[PDB]
Structure formats: C-alpha cells, structure tokens
Amino acid sequence: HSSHGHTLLLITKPSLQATALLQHLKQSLAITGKLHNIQRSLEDISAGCIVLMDMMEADKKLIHYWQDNLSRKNNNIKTLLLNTPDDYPYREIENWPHINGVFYATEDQEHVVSGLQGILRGECYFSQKLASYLITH
C-alpha cells in the first residue's frame, strides 16, 4: 500500500468525465493521481507512475509518441491500456514498454478497480491467453 510507491497518471482527453473516473480510482484505491492530455508532451513523469493510456484517444502517431517517450523512462513505471479495442492485436500490446495490463471494459468500473488493486499488489492484468503470449515471449 505504498504512496511513493504508486501514483495514477491518466493519459486521455481532458474532460469532466475523465476527472470523474480519476477521482473514483483515487478514492477507491487510496492513491494520488493526475490527468494528462494525451495530445500534449510530457517531460516530468514520477517514479511510481501507473500510466492509464486511453486507447480510444490514440491513433498511430500518438501510440508511437507515447511508446517512444515512455520507453525512455523507467523510472519504475507501469503502463495499462484503457478502453482498448477488442482485437487490438497481441503483437501490438507486447510492443508497449512496461506493459502491465489491458482494460477492455467501457461499462464495468468495478472490474477496473479490481484490476488496479492487483497492480498495486505486483500483479498484471491480462487474460490467461494474453499473459501466455507475453511470457513465451
């Protein structure tokens, strides 16, 4: 349960609803967090960051941009993909640096809280089939 530790970085289109989701995750997880505009560059990324990368706001350019500059880091960070297309290819997921989970659900907040509680415990959030793909390799 460390605060230094872990912090949420929600990278998406800034919106009232993104704020509502971030506040809900912060309160449910008892963690600090911030929202960052997916279309804006970032220089300062804290060490414990759990990046929630909004795939519905990402195109090929932004995927490349966020893959490129997050790989420069670590900095001990974890990337989880949010609002992920069904059938986003496994080959593409693997190419994300520091990839720790994939969220598909657009309706089940509780699903997502539970997954993030796992990440705080050192667990990834992958289906059995995707974890197997990633492990082997």
Q: How far is the CB of 34 from Mg ion (least distance, A)?
A: 12
Encoded tokens for 1:
């349960």
Encoded tokens for 75:
């900095």
**Residue 43 binds which entry of a copy of itself, Mg ion, none, CB below 5-8 Å type-dependent:** none
Q: How far is the CB of 96 from a copy of itself (least distance, A)?
A: 18
Q: Residue 115, Cα to own-chain centre: how many angstroms?
A: 11
Does position 27 bind a copy of itself by CB under 8 A? Answer: no
Q: 36-40, long-range: CB within 8 Å, 24+ apart, which pairs?
A: 36/9, 36/10, 36/11, 36/12, 37/11, 37/12, 37/13, 38/11, 38/12, 38/13, 38/62, 38/66, 39/13
Does position 15 bind a copy of itself by CB under 8 A? Answer: yes
**Candidate residues 6, 7, 12, 79; the one interacting with a copy of itself per rule CB under 8 A:** 12
**78-107 binders of a copy of itself (CB under 8 A):** 82-83, 103, 105-107
Helix axis angle, 109-120 relative to 16-29, nearest 10°?
50
Residue 55 or 93 with smaller CB distance to a copy of itself:
55
**44-63 binders of a copy of itself (CB under 8 A):** 54, 56
**Residue 37 binds which entry of Mg ion, a copy of itself, none, CB below 5-8 Å type-dependent:** Mg ion
